[PDB]
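Q: Predict the assembly, please.
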Amino acid sequence: MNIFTTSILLIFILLLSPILISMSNLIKHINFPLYTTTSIKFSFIISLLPLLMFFHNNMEYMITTWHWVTMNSMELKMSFKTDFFSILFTSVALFVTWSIMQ
Amino acid sequence: AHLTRRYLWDASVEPDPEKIPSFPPDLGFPERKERVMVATQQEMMDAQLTLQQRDYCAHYLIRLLKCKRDSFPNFLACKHEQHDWDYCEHLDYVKRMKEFERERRLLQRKKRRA
Amino acid sequence: IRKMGNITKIMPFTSSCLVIGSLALTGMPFLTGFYSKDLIIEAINTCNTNAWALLITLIATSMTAMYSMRIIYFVTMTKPRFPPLISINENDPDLMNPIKRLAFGSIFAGFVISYNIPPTSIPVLTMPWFLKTTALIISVLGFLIALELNN
Amino acid sequence: IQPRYREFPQLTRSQVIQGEFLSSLMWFWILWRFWHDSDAVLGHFSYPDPSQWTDEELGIPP
Amino acid sequence: YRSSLFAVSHVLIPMWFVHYYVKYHMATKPYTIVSSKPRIFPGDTILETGEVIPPMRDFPD
Amino acid sequence: DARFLRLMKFYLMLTGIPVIIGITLVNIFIGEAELAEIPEGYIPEHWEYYKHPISRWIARNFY
Amino acid sequence: WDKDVYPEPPSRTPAPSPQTSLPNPITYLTKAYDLVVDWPVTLVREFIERQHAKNRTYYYHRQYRRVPDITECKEGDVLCIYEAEMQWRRDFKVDQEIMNIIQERLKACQQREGENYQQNCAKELEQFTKVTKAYQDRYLDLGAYYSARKCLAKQKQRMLEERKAARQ
Amino acid sequence: TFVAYVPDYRMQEWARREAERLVKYREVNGLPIMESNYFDPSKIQLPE
Amino acid sequence: HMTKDMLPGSYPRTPEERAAAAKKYNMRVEDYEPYPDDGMGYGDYPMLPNRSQHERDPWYQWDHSELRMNWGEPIHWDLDMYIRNRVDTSPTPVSWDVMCKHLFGFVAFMVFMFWVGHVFPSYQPVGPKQYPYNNLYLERGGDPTKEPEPVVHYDI
Amino acid sequence: MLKIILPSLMLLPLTWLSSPKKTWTNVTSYSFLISLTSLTLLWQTDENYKNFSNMFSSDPLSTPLIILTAWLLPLMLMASQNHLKKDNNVLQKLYISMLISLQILLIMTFSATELIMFYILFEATLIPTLIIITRWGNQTERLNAGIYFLFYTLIGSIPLLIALILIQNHVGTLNLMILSFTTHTLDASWSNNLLWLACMMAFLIKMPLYGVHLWLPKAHVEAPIAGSMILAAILLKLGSYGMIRISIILDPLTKYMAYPFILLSLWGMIMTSSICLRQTDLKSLIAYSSVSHMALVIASIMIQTPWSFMGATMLMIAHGLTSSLLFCLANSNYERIHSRTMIMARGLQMVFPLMATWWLMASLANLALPPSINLMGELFITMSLFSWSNFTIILMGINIIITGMYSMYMIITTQRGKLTNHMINLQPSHTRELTLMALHMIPLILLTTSPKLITGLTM
Amino acid sequence: AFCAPPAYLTHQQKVLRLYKRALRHLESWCIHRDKYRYFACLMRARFEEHKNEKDMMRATQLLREAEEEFWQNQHPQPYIFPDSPGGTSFERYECYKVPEWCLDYWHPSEKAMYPDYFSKREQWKKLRMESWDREVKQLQEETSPDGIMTEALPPARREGDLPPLWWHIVTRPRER
Amino acid sequence: KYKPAPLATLPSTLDPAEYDVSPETRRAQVERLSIRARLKREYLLQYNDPKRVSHIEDPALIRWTYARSANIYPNFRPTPKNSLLGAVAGFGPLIFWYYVFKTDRDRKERLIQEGKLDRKFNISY
Amino acid sequence: SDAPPLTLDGIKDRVLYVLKLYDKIDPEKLSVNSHFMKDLGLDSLDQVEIIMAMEDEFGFEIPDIDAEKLMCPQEIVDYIADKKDVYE
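A: Predicted assembly structure:
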């Protein structure tokens, strides 16, 4: 129950990392397209794990990472709902996006 | 079929799907029988099923999901279970065909009475 | 399309993959299109669906094959109506590997998922053949008609 | 690579045999799971023709 | 070599930071994570005490 | 544009990174504190009803 | 983490029945994870907690003494009105946070019950409807310039209506 | 930095704490979590 | 630099003013024709053909290649909607009346047939799916203290 | 509060006596120090509002405006540092002094309790603006623009003052929170109705409706960057703050004394958002956008709901910053060209590759792209208005759509076409103006992150 | 697209343009080049039939019936040429087609490299100012007071000296 | 066949007023040409004019802006259908929206006074 | 997948290839300056069809303004060269 959220946040962290690199000065030295393609590949390989755990448990998951505000009985927070739909759509989208990037 | 039989041919006898018990339930059965369930509320709850999912055909499905989880990576190991589950749903759809036909024949009877 | 042709001979790889995709979209029985499209075409006629809606839906299921074979003919079976010069190149890996991976996916993942996901809903497996095989029959019809017209 | 002009180019075997690979693979898989699931298009179940039932069952008054 | 270095610098380190975050800032709070209840079946025993459970009645045909 | 980017990144990092580092060292060594209930012989002060060390430090020195 | 506040119902975990001739991937996968990742993280956590304990610090919870209310408060005079209105704002904020707590516990119960939310997730909904009738009859139509005076007028009009109903 | 390390801005933390404690108290003692009447209707007096 | 003589003015009611206005706007008199006088503010700014800018000769290397307009060529009062990123009067092989007729006819036919099919739908010749426990009267909330209509389901 | 004011009253002699080569830098950096020190107000541990004397005070609804003003001062300075470059040192010193007087007045008023002090400061705001607009413009109609500005404002001012007198006499004092703890209810007759009018008419005339939006475009056009900044950012906000602080007494009148003003505000939002499509002058487009958003602010202010007030404050701050930024960008593209027209310069982004990303990041904040305080405010206000009636989502949506349209029209007629060939005067970006853009933006990021500061009274 | 057209036209060019348009629309209708050749020959015969005729009456009549038949039997979605209007490459590169004068504002730290090319810009601009004023008198001397001119531009009637108004044409970036 | 429209103008060729062979009309065309050529030449004597450190001024653009912005009220003369359209746009729609909102609010108010409208969960407003 | 650019020799050889495959009047021996209407007694139809064939051979389009005036293969080549900016 810790590997799951770990992966679900790691995929977003991977996709972030290049964007961050964009800010920096390495691009003029580095092959940004291959960098991003491979980061996406590893994001997909990560996203796969949720599929195995989900088909083996069929346990949906719901998370509230960060609490943004508290607006007088109507709060807000970065909430994820890793259920069948999204946990599968991530993998499909990455399987496509890796090829598209190449 | 019944569609045109209703729309361009005879216009009333063709029954209505949404009022089936409109006729008494034992107009031709001397002490008609009733149905049976082979899985209890507690089981069909703890197994976390859905409402368009849990019918009188639920035990086959429970055994199916057990055999599917167990040996998960060796999937395709639950096929004699799917066959039986589809068999039960076929049986149910046949029961419904038969109830519709029953109402059709009973309307035929009523109209024969006039 | 009006300025291309002979794509099969001049470029077999993309044409093979394009045919794969075209037939999958038509609804070929086991190419990851079937495993959703044909259950959908079951339910569409099996439930209390509005007549005109059902009808235009099946017409569209045919027009799928229609314009797919349109692509096929106008791009892959007629003559090379494109300019004389040629600098073809597809032996590059960054363009030959992705399509390969995507074809393997488009052939396997549909089946894999249809057999691995929890069975959300209760299907309906009791109907006549002329309602269980409607999509198949009508797509074959589209193939024949497109051939006749393109010729 | 070296272009041509109003002529057909000399092609390599890798790309063409990869295309043949993909297509033969599709045909193989189709035949395999057709063999294994010939009923997925027909169904193992028999749809009934009413007028074959009996007023005996589903009791009716005549 | 670069394969291993990339694996490290783009999977491992973030994994360490995120495991820290999760297991000591998120599961340390009332309803941050919600592990949907598992899908029990009949017969299935329990890694907790959970005495044996009963199967159903007749399975004709 | 290269000049603006580089100089802004400098004149930010310069004090952002030392500060963030001090913050990390504080959270590690000092860290947050406990919800010690109120004894019946002590009247806490404004620099003790707040959790974070930096917060209570400021509340003790300035405010 | 007051568990009496946040129930956290029990966890009827199932058991493993791996009946096949093939190995579970999750076994080795999670073993290797718990091996390589949790080890350093756990050691570092212990280090941090030890430094904490050696340079420990405490902090209390502010207890606001109570005071008279708007009722026992002569009009025109203010000091009393202020020392009452601010207490009332505190109470208002606390009630809002209570609402938040109820909603959080409710969403928890819902998800943790899954598809059976219509049967086992009905208890908390009753606490919700009750608490919400309360929060409505208290703080519904005040206005961004809300305050004890307007809340009291609300209460009083409602009491008068209920009493007229009772008497007829 | 100053802002981010400001404490309990307008009490949105002390209040959460206080609500937790009060809910514990009342859940135990059997009272309801929120009464539909705020001020004591006894000390109050009304016309006819 | 600009000046009143070079800027617009009032509605010229005399060819004396008209010709000077035209030579100012860099046009020719016999083509110059201002807007009517309803006092909406048009003043004396020429009235030009209500044509878009997708029409203009696209080959000539205009100076304003994004507007296909030359330097002093007077500017259509309503250019803001003819900037070529907007309304296009590019003539059509088909015509206005006939295209509108086609579209409306098609859409009317479609919606009419949809209503028709809703009034005379399709459905499979069977009854309604059954449900064991009073349509699961519990799992749909129900209550633990009420015995509503006993929904018994029979065999055929 | 003196800790915020006195130094701002020392920047003046500082400017006067400092040498030319150093006055700019000295005054700028020290104004930044003032901006920094202006954060002490954010130590609002508990709900007990801050009161420093019978003459000053702070609040959650005022503090944001205070900081925003103390931080827009130096941006005005900087953006006012390439033009008037051939104007004498004494003249530029006068300009600086006027800016600083504006800052000081705005702070004192956004802090003061007694609405009469608030009013004298609200009306002393003029002289520096009128001056800045007449003596440093670039066209001729600036005169008529200043006249309109001044006289609209004073016509508003008068009955406001008369009603403040009627109050000070009927009631004993004018101090706020005393007005609260001793307010009452009115017999709701024509007298009290005209009183409601004479109290809100000035604040409205300032925060423009459809009917009196006329002095805004003239100002923002004929006037320079600093006047445009300060108008679009604060001198409107003064009306909103006054209305918020004063409406506390006029209950219940504002239930039926609002329908005309709400109607006007919404219809004007719509018509002005439409004109923003076909308004050539860039600064005029920006001004009418400001009108379109302040109409939302007003519609949210009247009906008096907490969600509405918080949304008003959010959108207020957001629009202030975003409009200052857009005006910086306009000025920038003007100094190189000297023509406000939108369709003259086109097809940039090939020579100002970065600047675009300071153009883009503004539009997206205008059309309410989230996560932004802009959309948070628009959305909470739409919620309040939906509750107040179910037939206002219509207008909310029409406005959202027309905005999503003209923002991109503006992006695309200046940074999306193909480059002209006679604009040889395209001096590349200055680090100074890039800095101004970055400084207007970054705070949007930080506040999108932590907005609890920027909520309002109700939070 | 460099030379400019005359104000009026002639029957000749009108018929030519109708011919080219119809043949393109036929290439679009009838895809196969064999069918295209066939029907193009048919259209050529149709034209050569009335070719030798010269009566303006029959000319205008046939032309205005031909344009109507063309507009009524044209292709809805014709065959556009990519590099020309309507296509999928028109202006595609204008986002990269920068002009030269962006050069002057380079920084010396950048034009440090690329030194040779900047060693030749000067001798190019030097090839402009030294021969500009002359390019004016060539017109101000030949600015025929008749005052009826076209958009054409005369060459350098002298030798050695350069033509008039070559800047806005030379230095026009590539197409890429 | 084909008909004109305010959108799809009659294309160039089909226009009967084209194919005319009038000497006067052709002379007008050639005069337009003389004009346009003078303009383009005056423009090209500046596009390439060396020693230039500035841009070009488009007086047509300036005059267009003047006529859209500030030449309006002076040449404006009020008349009916104009005053009428103005009063319409300024009064009608406001009042329509107003009747709508007032009717809705009165409905809601009487409903609540009856004590019916389900307001459950309307805790924040 | 960009092929290499075009040069004058290639352009000339191609143009001769095409104008020789032409059959109407060309006596299979074209001088680079083999004027169509003057030096070969051709027709406007033929010239226009030549221009169209060249358009198809080189992908792009030649506008009428210059199609009507081209009367020399050397002129066609000069036009193509000044359009594609060849021979650095």
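The CA atoms of residues 62 and 87 of chain A lie 12 Å apart. Helices of chain A lie at 3-23, 32-57, 84-101.
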